[PDB]
Amino acid sequence: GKIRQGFIKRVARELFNKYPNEFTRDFEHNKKKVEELTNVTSKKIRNRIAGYITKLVRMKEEGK
Amino acid sequence: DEGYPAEVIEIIGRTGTTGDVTQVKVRILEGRDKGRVIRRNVRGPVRVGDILILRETEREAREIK
Amino acid sequence: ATVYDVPGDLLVERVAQRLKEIPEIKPPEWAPFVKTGRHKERLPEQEDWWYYRVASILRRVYLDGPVGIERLRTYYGGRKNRGHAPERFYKAGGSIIRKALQQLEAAGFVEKVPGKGRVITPKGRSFLDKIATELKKELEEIIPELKKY
Amino acid sequence: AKPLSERFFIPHEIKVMGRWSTEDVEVRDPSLKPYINLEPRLLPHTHGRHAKKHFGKANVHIVERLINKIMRSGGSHYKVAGHFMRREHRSLNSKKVKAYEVVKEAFKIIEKRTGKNPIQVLVWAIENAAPREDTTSVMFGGIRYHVAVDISPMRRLDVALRNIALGASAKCYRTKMSFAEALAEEIILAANKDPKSYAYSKKLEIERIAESSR
Amino acid sequence: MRIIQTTGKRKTAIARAVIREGKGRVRINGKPVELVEPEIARFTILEPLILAGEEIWNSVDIDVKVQGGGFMGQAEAARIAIARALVEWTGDMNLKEKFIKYDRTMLVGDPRRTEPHKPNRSTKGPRAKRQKSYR
RNA sequence: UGGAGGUGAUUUAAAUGCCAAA
RNA sequence: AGUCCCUCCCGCUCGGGAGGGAGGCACUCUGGGGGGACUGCCGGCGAUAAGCCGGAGGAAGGGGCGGGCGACGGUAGGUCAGUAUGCCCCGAAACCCCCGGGCUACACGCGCGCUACAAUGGGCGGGACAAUGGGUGCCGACCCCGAAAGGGGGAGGUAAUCCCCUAAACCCGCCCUCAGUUCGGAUCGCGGGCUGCAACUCGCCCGCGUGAAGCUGGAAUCCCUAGUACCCGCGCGUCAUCAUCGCGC
Numbered sequence: 045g046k047i048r049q050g051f052i053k054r055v056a057r058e059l060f061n062k063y064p065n066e067f068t069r070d071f072e073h074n075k076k077k078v079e080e081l082t083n084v085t086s087k088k089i090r091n092r093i094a095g096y097i098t099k100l101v102r103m104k105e106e107g108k
Numbered sequence: 109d110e111g112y113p114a115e116v117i118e119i120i121g122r123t124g125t126t127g128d129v130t131q132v133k134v135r136i137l138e139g140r141d142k143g144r145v146i147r148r149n150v151r152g153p154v155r156v157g158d159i160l161i162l163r164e165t166e167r168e169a170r171e172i173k
Numbered sequence: 174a175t176v177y178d179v180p181g182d183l184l185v186e187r188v189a190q191r192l193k194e195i196p197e198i199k200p201p202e203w204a205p206f207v208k209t210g211r212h213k214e215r216l217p218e219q220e221d222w223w224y225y226r227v228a229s230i231l232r233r234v235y236l237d238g239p240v241g242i243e244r245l246r247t248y249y250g251g252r253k254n255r256g257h258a259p260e261r262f263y264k265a266g267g268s269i270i271r272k273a274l275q276q277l278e279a280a281g282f283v284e285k286v287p288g289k290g291r292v293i294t295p296k297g298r299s300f301l302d303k304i305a306t307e308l309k310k311e312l313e314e315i316i317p318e319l320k321k322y
Numbered sequence: 323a324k325p326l327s328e329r330f331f332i333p334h335e336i337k338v339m340g341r342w343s344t345e346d347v348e349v350r351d352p353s354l355k356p357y358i359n360l361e362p363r364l365l366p367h368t369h370g371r372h373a374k375k376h377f378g379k380a381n382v383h384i385v386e387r388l389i390n391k392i393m394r395s396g397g398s399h400y401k402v403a404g405h406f407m408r409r410e411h412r413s414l415n416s417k418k419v420k421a422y423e424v425v426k427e428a429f430k431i432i433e434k435r436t437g438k439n440p441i442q443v444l445v446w447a448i449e450n451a452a453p454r455e456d457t458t459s460v461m462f463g464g465i466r467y468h469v470a471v472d473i474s475p476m477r478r479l480d481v482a483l484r485n486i487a488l489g490a491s492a493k494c495y496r497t498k499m500s501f502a503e504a505l506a507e508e509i510i511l512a513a514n515k516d517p518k519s520y521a522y523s524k525k526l527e528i529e530r531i532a533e534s535s536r
Numbered sequence: 537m538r539i540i541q542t543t544g545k546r547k548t549a550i551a552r553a554v555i556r557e558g559k560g561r562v563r564i565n566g567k568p569v570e571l572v573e574p575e576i577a578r579f580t581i582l583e584p585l586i587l588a589g590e591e592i593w594n595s596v597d598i599d600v601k602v603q604g605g606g607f608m609g610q611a612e613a614a615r616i617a618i619a620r621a622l623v624e625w626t627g628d629m630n631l632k633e634k635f636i637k638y639d640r641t642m643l644v645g646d647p648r649r650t651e652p653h654k655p656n657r658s659t660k661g662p663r664a665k666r667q668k669s670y671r
Numbered sequence: 672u673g674g675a676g677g678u679g680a681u682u683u684a685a686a687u688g689c690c691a692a693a
Numbered sequence: 694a695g696u697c698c699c700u701c702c703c704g705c706u707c708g709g710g711a712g713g714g715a716g717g718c719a720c721u722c723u724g725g726g727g728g729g730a731c732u733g734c735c736g737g738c739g740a741u742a743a744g745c746c747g748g749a750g751g752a753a754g755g756g757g758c759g760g761g762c763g764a765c766g767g768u769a770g771g772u773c774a775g776u777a778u779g780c781c782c783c784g785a786a787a788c789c790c791c792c793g794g795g796c797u798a799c800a801c802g803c804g805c806g807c808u809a810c811a812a813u814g815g816g817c818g819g820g821a822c823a824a825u826g827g828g829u830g831c832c833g834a835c836c837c838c839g840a841a842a843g844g845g846g847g848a849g850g851u852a853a854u855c856c857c858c859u860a861a862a863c864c865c866g867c868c869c870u871c872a873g874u875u876c877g878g879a880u881c882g883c884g885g886g887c888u889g890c891a892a893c894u895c896g897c898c899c900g901c902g903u904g905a906a907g908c909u910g911g912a913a914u915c916c917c918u919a920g921u922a923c924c925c926g927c928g929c930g931u932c933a934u935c936a937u938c939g940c941g942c
């Protein structure tokens with residue numbers, strides 16, 4: 045089961061609202077931005093957060 | 109004496125006492141009733157596009173849920 | 174052509190046939206009564222197994238010298254059936270190998286490096302390589318791909 | 323014994339074991355046609371990379387399938403011709419070299435005795451030994467009953483191969499015949515619909531029982 | 537004077553191959569490849585050469601040093617090294633395309649390794665267990 | 672959403688509770 | 694691996710090999726740091742959510758694979774014969790030492806295994822390829838003596854340096870040809886050795902001889918989904934000597 049974790053979602057939503065004009069639909073750009081904007085040390089957690097942020101960006105751009 | 113080939117076009121679901129049997133829909137390719145579509149029970153792994161060799165083409169499996 | 178260019182068993186057979194002309198190679202007096210190791214069960218069946226063993230030892234020294242008695246004993250060991258117990262690996266005896274090496278040295282084919290073992294002399298290397306060349310000349314008539322090597 | 327030209331054999335074309343071509347082999351049965359792999363290939367040894375994925379065994383050369391089928395003991399937990407055949411330590415399990423040699427010698431014998439391409443004879447045997455209707459069991463009142471069903475092509479191929487292997491294994495057990503000779507004899511008998519073949523008789527019995535319980 | 541080196545790995549067997557211009561001589565630890573036994577091992581090494589063709593085969597010399605593993609593991613590592621050396625030396629993508637169709641593992645390798653053993657009949661395997669009794 | 676009635680059917684066999692708690 | 698020098702072999706050397714010294718960090722390896730995979734991309738189902746199914750590219754694809762870590766409680770489950778500990782007992786014996794016995798007995802029932810009942814073999818000669826670990830109360834190369842088990846000297850090693858350490862299944866050639874046998878090796882006789890203060894009760898190894906049941910197993914019943922199961926050997930623990938065991942390769 046590939047179920048996203050709660051704190052991943054929470055931190056991703058907090059980052060998205062704080063800097064709406066900072067993330068694009070590109071995974072690498074979001075990965076670097078997440079690396080620089082937080083104190084996360086685990087490489088896996090960074091990837092999870094960046095992926096969810098990418099999904100959020102493309103979902104809001106589509107307008108739901 | 110040699111049977112009739114039929115082609116599987118749809119998978120319905122598993123059945124049997126231990127889930128060993130699959131129910132499918134087949135289309136007759138040769139013989140008296142060529143072109144008709146009937147449902148059958150099959151033992152063994154099966155996928156869409158396979159061809160079965162029926163020894164007679166008048167028995168139809170009872171529908172399962 | 175060198176020893177590396179021919180199958181081992183054919184070369185051993187040819188060398189064993191050739192070694193019977195060397196006066197210094199003679200089976201010892203206790204040869205007809207012994208086994209070739211504690212892991213065997215019956216006596217050797219060939220009436221001239223001594224020459225085969227000597228030829229094998231010579232080719233062994235050619236390829237892995239310097240080498241001593243103990244490592245050769247390891248090489249000639251094998252699996253033993255122990256009745257109701259599981260099979261196990263065991264080493265071979267020492268008298269056969271030591272006598273063969275001493276006879277080969279007396280023939281001038283090997284020499285002793287102190288503290289290290291025994292190595293092949295130029296005479297022995299020539300003796301082996303000539304037979305290897307002859308065998309390869311015979312062999313490539315039926316395997317044309319060997320003419321390149 | 324064996325000539326040096328055979329001990330050191332060098333191939334130059336992509337063909338089965340460097341000795342036989344499968345260009346003219348044809349499969350008559352429409353159902354087994356896409357499940358008998360006959361693509362050009364030199365060495366039939368895929369190192370078991372196919373069992374992981376679903377339907378992965380479809381694209382494995384038929385000769386390697388036979389080699390894997392005979393790489394066994396034979397009679398572990400059911401009786402073949404009225405006997406358990408537990409080979410144990412002397413069994414051929416996990417020795418792919420010996421099975422390879424057995425198959426090669428059997429193919430040589432088949433080609434010598436009939437004068438045809440061995441792969442063609444093998445295809446004919448598996449075509450004749452594959453059943454078309456089977457049965458499944460139900461329980462009522464403490465009694466077991468049979469109900470007739472149909473067989474998918476891949477299971478047909480598996481059953482044919484297993485029965486050929488079992489017949490060959492039974493023929494050489496504690497007799498003067500060797501394994502290669504038994505395999506060749508079984509294949510030849512099955513190709514001619516001879517009842518003395520274990521696989522053909524087994525197929526006939528299976529289909530009879532299935533018919534008598536529609 | 538071109539010299540190219542390649543590497544192959546297969547379950548603790550390691551092979552290093554060196555390829556250069558030559559006459560068609562291939563040696564495995566100093567032995568000509570035509571004398572490798574048993575036959576099933578010899579055909580494993582020869583497949584990339586047969587696929588490449590006779591013109592390419594007779595124009596190069598290959599020497600392979602392989603250590604570790606067993607007699608079947610060593611042959612496959614040599615096969616991988618030879619295939620990589622061939623595709624790099626000639627540098628044409630038609631041959632590389634042909635190898636992938638025949639056998640992908642020739643170029644990507646095989647990552648399988650043994651699984652460590654576990655208690656309850658450890659010496660047999662990680663999953664085989666002692667027979668269970670109730671009375 | 673939650674309730675009250677009616678008509679049909681319902682695939683072999685399958686008994687018992689010692690020791691102990693004291 | 695490429696380059697240089699010296700020596701020795703072969704078809705007499707155009708060519709092809711093997712050692713040694715210089716020299717090098719290319720390749721393998723060793724071990725610190727970093728990258729890489731996120732349902733990220735594409736098509737469907739579902740609700741447009743959560744997710745699911747199927748493809749591309751990729752060393753790796755959907756907890757990537759294998760392990761460690763076991764919540765609040767219960768089981769009057771096991772352990773006071775590992776250690777800690779209350780109560781009751783012995784307290785000149787139920788405490789402390791020494792000698793000899795026993796735990797190793799044998800009409801019989803049961804658990805887990807090893808060896809077999811043979812050709813998918815037995816014997817003899819020859820040819821190939823490992824990994825994990827361990828070593829100063831120790832590992833011991835190399836030489837000599839002996840038919841074997843073993844015996845007498847003894848380099849190097851407090852160890853990526855020296856040693857245990859040239860595995861077996863597998864391949865090639867010859868004998869045996871379906872037989873209680875050239876299958877099986879239990880049981881017993883004579884002789885030779887090692888450890889130890891001591892080998893009868895009660896140790897392990899070697900040579901010759903002897904040659905039991907067993908010819909595939911009723912009702913029942915166990916393990917296992919991929920480098921997994923089956924088959925084959927090896928290392929460490931225990932250890933003066935002793936492995937059909939445990940944990941690993």
Ligand SMILES: [Mg+2]
Pocket residue numbers: none
């Ligand atoms: Mg050997």
Ligand SMILES: [Mg+2]
Pocket residue numbers: 254
């Ligand atoms: Mg045995």
Ligand SMILES: [Mg+2]
Pocket residue numbers: 650651661
């Ligand atoms: Mg394993």
Ligand SMILES: [Mg+2]
Pocket residue numbers: 769
């Ligand atoms: Mg209790």
Ligand SMILES: [Mg+2]
Pocket residue numbers: none
């Ligand atoms: Mg006891």
Ligand SMILES: [Mg+2]
Pocket residue numbers: none
């Ligand atoms: Mg015997």
Ligand SMILES: [Mg+2]
Pocket residue numbers: 895
């Ligand atoms: Mg005694």
Ligand SMILES: [Mg+2]
Pocket residue numbers: 908
């Ligand atoms: Mg018998």
